[PDB]
Symmetry: C2
Subunit: 147 residues, 2 copies
């Protein structure tokens, strides 16, 4: 089964909100505690701003649904520690990946993403990931089993 605390990166959050995922989204929000990094929220909004959506309004909706986690001092410190040792090993990941993974570790959330291997170098620091497609199938199974 799946753990209670989970999170998504911007790409995954975009899909979770697509019209084809309406049902899966409803179940996920009803059964899980989703902790999103403000960074993930900002990047999601960039995609929404691209198609001229009302950002201010969509932000309130997200805030009214999710536990939006700020870039806390502890996250800033932890992220700097992870990035520095990774960099010391010629491993370079973009800022979004670092903050997203650091926040997942901090909130003890399973990071659902369509590209888990990209985050693989952060596992050693405590990060746990799961393929989005497997996550979706898991939730569907949950629905099938219900009374």
């Amino acid at each position: 089964p799946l753990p209670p605390d989970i999170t998504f990166d911007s790409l995954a959050l975009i899909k979770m909100h697509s019209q084809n995922m309406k049902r899966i989204l409803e179940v996920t929000l009803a059964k899980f505690t989703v902790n999103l990094s403000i960074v993930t929220v900002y990047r999601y909004l960039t995609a929404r701003a691209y198609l001229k959506k009302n950002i201010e309004a969509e932000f309130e909706i997200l805030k009214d649904i999710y536990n939006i986690v700020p870039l806390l001092d502890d996250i800033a410190i932890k992220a700097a520690q992870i990035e520095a040792n990774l960099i010391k090993k010629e491993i370079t990941l973009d800022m979004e990946d670092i903050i997203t993974a650091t926040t997942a570790i901090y909130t003890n959330s399973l990071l659902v993403t369509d590209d888990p291997k990209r985050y693989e170098p952060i596992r050693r620091f405590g990060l746990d990931t799961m393929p989005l497609d497997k996550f979706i199938k898991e939730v569907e199974l949950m629905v099938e089993k219900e009374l």
Copy 2:
């Protein structure tokens, strides 16, 4: 005519802390209000880990010296609008740059950097920049 509020991107801030800048830094903190994005300080701490391994202690030191601005919701929102506008023009600045510039606008701070051209496409949104070299010269004098 330097303004009261200023900021730096991580690269510029790293130089401001060079041993050979102690004087310039002392005057700066003495005459200006420096508002740094939380993103800028994490990159700064990351880049100096080879010199100061105690990230936690280093963060506390910074928190006491500067005004550290969080990635507030309004900054998140505005950063999204700006990035979408740049992407439409096929301009791809990295996250740090977008948030640094967005925070500067939010705090009404002059962004001191070594690469102002990079940020130029954002001036239409209220951003104000100045070359680190000029800033250093402008500061050399009471």
